[PDB]
Amino acid sequence: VINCAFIGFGKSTTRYHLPYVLNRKDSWHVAHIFRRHAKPEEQAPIYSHIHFTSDLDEVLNDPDVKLVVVCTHADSHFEYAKRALEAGKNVLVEKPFTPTLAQAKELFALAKSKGLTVTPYQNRRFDSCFLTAKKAIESGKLGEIVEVESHFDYYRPVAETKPGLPQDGAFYGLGVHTMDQIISLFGRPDHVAYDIRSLRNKANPDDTFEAQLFYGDLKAIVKTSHLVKIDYPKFIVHGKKGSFIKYGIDQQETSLKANIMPGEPGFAADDSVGVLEYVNDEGVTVREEMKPEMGDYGRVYDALYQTITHGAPNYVKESEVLTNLEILERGFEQASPSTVTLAK
Amino acid sequence: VINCAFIGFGKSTTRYHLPYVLNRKDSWHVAHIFRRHAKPEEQAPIYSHIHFTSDLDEVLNDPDVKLVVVCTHADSHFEYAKRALEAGKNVLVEKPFTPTLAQAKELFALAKSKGLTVTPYQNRRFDSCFLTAKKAIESGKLGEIVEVESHFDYYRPVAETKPGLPQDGAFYGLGVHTMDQIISLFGRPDHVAYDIRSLRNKANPDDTFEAQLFYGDLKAIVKTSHLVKIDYPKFIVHGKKGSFIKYGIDQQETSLKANIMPGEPGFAADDSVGVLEYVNDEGVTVREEMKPEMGDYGRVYDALYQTITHGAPNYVKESEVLTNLEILERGFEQASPSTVTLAK
């Protein structure tokens, strides 16, 4: 069993992490939880075994803790990650990994010297919708892939005034997850075309974007908007032999918000299906309905266990992290719309 | 009744012009049809009243001819149009208007000096799918428009090798129509983002494209691909108060190919509907299913009638034509993908 520690006890901790970790008692043990103010959500029995503390000193000096999870405000992610590594602990950092690309390299350099692992929390690589699109692409039924389109939208027309930097916009906010999915499938692109804008409140950072990643002749589109009344399909994949369409997004989050935990009845209840229409070897057009693949954000921790306990490679490659961060930053080199060619 | 004449007697003339013109005998009379070589179709009883000739002068010298329709090979459009205007005739030209922007500008200057009308044939401005989207946009129900998406796709995976120039590709071929629709609604864009690729056969001109026209904060997307097994909606429109979605394209071409002529029972029969979902002034979400507006390519001739007889403005504005040609040309200004800003 690996002893882990969480830095921060906010909603992200209690909703997107603990439910999955506390469900793996035979593999993980939440030894510490750092934070300041409390929450009437601490008096709960489920956290009875945890040592909540307001001194990050006791956490990092614990020889038993092998993993620190940073779930605090974005501004503190870099420093907490660095301090944890200098203490000799592996680190999982929620988005953002670091404010800048240079800092990401810095963090990776320190970890490599100590021979430790530092990585972002890319839990959406395990979304049911995404996994279904992945299975469809790896089935080979679609032939050579020529286009992929991923949507992550809302219909939230009212935006309270809240100025910020690019890092506070939707491109960094949601694009980091959606683009990471694309990169995890096709790697690093040759070119990137950007369309970034602020539609709801002109005082705020972008709330609408579309990034087009070009891999040779394959174009991968990632887009989000807070002004979509009628939803687009969650994923669309076109290949020379056929198409795959998936409406509906992973339901883990919906369940968690409705106070339904992993393993519990009706968790991630999903009645959608992926549609697959292609031409088989015999030249006959076939149409199939795929039952959604199962999603499990917990797989992040099962992979971390592998890395820490057996030296297994990190579920998220360093290059995929840097590529993603680099694409995000270059989207601001010149006013939108713009196009760039990735050097490295 | 206005007398007209056609330069060229190919498929375009017998499929997209005559069926409509011959249904307006109280408005128009086809006096002559020029063609370099006699064609078998000239023997169809429906053309018995038409004088077919290989002597162009016999047409341009006819005092009663007021409109000349150029439907020959693209490379001869400028030459025939200029000759018709010099003979004092109004001119309607099939795609492409001219090979270049300068020639187009030259055609308009000549027409202006003679008080004549020269215009392209943009019949898709009367496609039922497009007209329904236009009605939705003009209804005000969607509120400020932020995104428009137009698709004109196929699933034709086989493309025999047939080298050519940019002018032979899908962008010039189909984009001329889809971009014209966007231009007729919003005008001249500030910027254009291009993605032009040749996927089926690398030896051939482009068969895949996506042009993004920006009008302030509004983005209009026009795209086509010959590798779409599962179709996208024909039009998608998103505004701040709602959305409009329309699957299915105008059915006039389908009827024409099935040998059903305009005015005949069942012509362009369409069972699709435009779907609308918006938030009303009271804050309630309203759902509406719109019956497709009726499309009629002959409305081009009804417009030419008014223009020629009563001096009504031409259905297509000069600026829209020049903007279209410029956008198409600049798509090959640099390697794809690319973005450009329009001075006009």
Show the 3-state SS of chain A: CEEEEEECCCHHHHHHHHHHHCCCCCCEEEEEEECCCCCCCCCCHHHCCCEEECCHHHHHCCCCEEEEEECCCHHHHHHHHHHHHHCCCEEEECCCCCCCHHHHHHHHHHHHHHCCCEEECCHHHHCHHHHHHHHHHHHCCCCCEEEEEEECCCECCCCCCCCCCHHHCHHHHCHHHHHHHHHHHHCCCCEEEEEEECCCCCCCCCCEEEEEEEECCEEEEEEEECECCCCCCCEEEEECCEEEEECCCCCHHHHHHCCCCCCCCCCCCCCCCEEEEEECCCCCEEEEEECCCCCCCCHHHHHHHHHHHHCCCCCCCHHHHHHHHHHHHHCCCCCCCEEEECCC
Contact B270, B264 (CB under 8 A): no
Smallest CA–CA distance from B156 into chain A, residue: A240
From chain A, the residues in CB contact with B242 under 8 A are 229-230
Integer Cα distance of A300 and A90 in angstroms: 14
- Centroid of chain to Cα B247: 19
CB burial of A140-169 (b: ≥16 within 10 Å; e: otherwise) equals ebbbebbbbbbbbbebebeeeeeeeeebbb
Query: Shortest CA distance to B272 belongs to which of B297, B299, B254, B298?
Result: B254
- From the list A210, A229, A339, which residue is nearest B278 (CB)? A229
Write the CB contacts of B78 (distance below 8 Å, at least 6 apart in sequence): B98, B99, B103, B107
Length of chain A (residues)? 344
Question: Any alpha helices (H) in chain B, and if so which ranges?
Answer: 11-12, 18-21, 57-60, 77-86, 101-114, 128-139, 170, 176-186, 252-257, 299-310, 318-330
DSSP label at residue B92: E
Mark yes or no for CB contact A230/B157 under 8 Å.
no
Mark yes or no for CB contact A227/B217 under 8 Å.
no
- From the list A157, A214, A236, which residue is nearest B337 (CB)? A214
Integer Cα distance of A179 and A184 in angstroms: 8
Interface with chain B: mutation pick from A190, A241, A333, A339, highest number of B CBs within 10 Å? A339
Contact B209, B223 (CB under 8 A): yes
Integer Cα distance of B301 and A109 in angstroms: 71
Integer Cα distance of A136 and A124 in angstroms: 17
Mark yes or no for CB contact B238/A219 under 8 Å.
no
Pairing mode, if any, of strands A274-279 and A242-246?
antiparallel
Integer Cα distance of B324 and B180 in angstroms: 6
Task: Give Dmax over CA atoms of chain A in angstroms.
Answer: 67
CA end-to-end span of chain A, whole Å? 40
Integer Cα distance of B230 and B246 in angstroms: 15
User: What was the experiment behind these coordinates?
Assistant: X-ray
Smallest CA–CA distance from B190 into chain A, residue: A337
Angle (CA) B4 B19 B134, round 5°: 95
3-state secondary structure at position B270 = coil
Query: Shortest CA distance to A120 belongs to which of A316, A308, A313, A344?
Result: A316
Report the gap between the CA of A244 and the closest CA in chain B (Å): 8
Pairing mode, if any, of strands A118-120 and B65-70?
unpaired
**Which two three-digit tokens encode residue A246?**
């998936």
Query: Shortest CA distance to A338 belongs to which of A197, A215, A242, A223?
Result: A197
Report the gap between the CA of A287 and the closest CA in chain B (Å): 10
What is the signed CA dihedral for A168, A172, A173, A174, rounded to 10 degrees?
160
Domain boundaries, chain A: 1-121, 122-344
Q: What are phi and psi of A224, to 5 degrees?
A: -145, 150
- From the list B228, B239, B337, which residue is nearest A339 (CB)? B337
- What architecture (CATH level 2) is domain A122-344? 2-Layer Sandwich (3.30)
Report the gap between the CA of A151 and the closest CA in chain B (Å): 14
Contact B209, B196 (CB under 8 A): yes
From chain A, the residues in CB contact with B339 under 8 A are 193, 337-339
Interface residues of chain A, partner chain B, Cβ below 8 Å: 146-147, 157, 191, 193, 195, 197, 199-200, 208, 210, 212, 214, 217, 219, 225, 227-230, 232, 236, 238-245, 275, 277-279, 285, 337-339
Integer Cα distance of A298 and B232 in angstroms: 35
Q: What are phi and psi of A193, to 5 degrees?
A: -110, 135
Q: What are phi and psi of B148, to 5 degrees?
A: -130, 135
Mark yes or no for CB contact B146/A225 under 8 Å.
yes
**Which two three-digit tokens encode residue A145?**
């892939």
Report the gap between the CA of B203 and the closest CA in chain A (Å): 14
Residue A119: C-alpha distances to residues A8, A16, A27, A111, A112 (Å): 17, 16, 19, 10, 12
Burial of B299 (C-beta count, 10 Å sphere; 0-12/13-18/19+): middle
Contact A247, A233 (CB under 8 A): yes
Task: Give Dmax over CA atoms of chain B in angstroms.
Answer: 67
Integer Cα distance of A320 and A173 in angstroms: 17
Q: What are phi and psi of A226, to 5 degrees?
A: -100, 10
- From the list A193, A212, A238, which residue is nearest B228 (CB)? A238
Mark yes or no for CB contact B337/A245 under 8 Å.
no
- Centroid of chain to Cα B153: 16
**Which two three-digit tokens encode residue A278?**
């292609």
Query: Shortest CA distance to B188 belongs to which of B330, B313, B304?
Result: B330
Mark yes or no for CB contact A338/B338 under 8 Å.
no
Please state, as a whole number, how many other Cβ atoms lie within 10 Å of the Cβ of residue A31.
19
Integer Cα distance of B67 and B87 in angstroms: 11
From chain A, the residues in CB contact with B197 under 8 A are 217, 219
- From the list B228, B241, B245, which residue is nearest A243 (CB)? B228
Integer Cα distance of B232 and B227 in angstroms: 12
From chain A, the residues in CB contact with B240 under 8 A are 157, 199-200, 227
- From the list A200, A241, A277, which residue is nearest B230 (CB)? A277
From chain A, the residues in CB contact with B229 under 8 A are 238, 241-243, 277-279, 285
Mark yes or no for CB contact A229/B279 under 8 Å.
yes
Mark yes or no for CB contact A193/B197 under 8 Å.
no
Q: Which fold has domain A1-121?
A: Rossmann fold (3.40.50)
3-state secondary structure at position B19 = helix
Mark yes or no for CB contact B227/A146 under 8 Å.
yes
Please state, as a whole number, how many other Cβ atoms lie within 10 Å of the Cβ of residue A76.
12
Integer Cα distance of B278 and B239 in angstroms: 9
Report the gap between the CA of B219 and the closest CA in chain A (Å): 9
| HSE, side-chain direction, 13 A CA sphere, residue B35 | 16
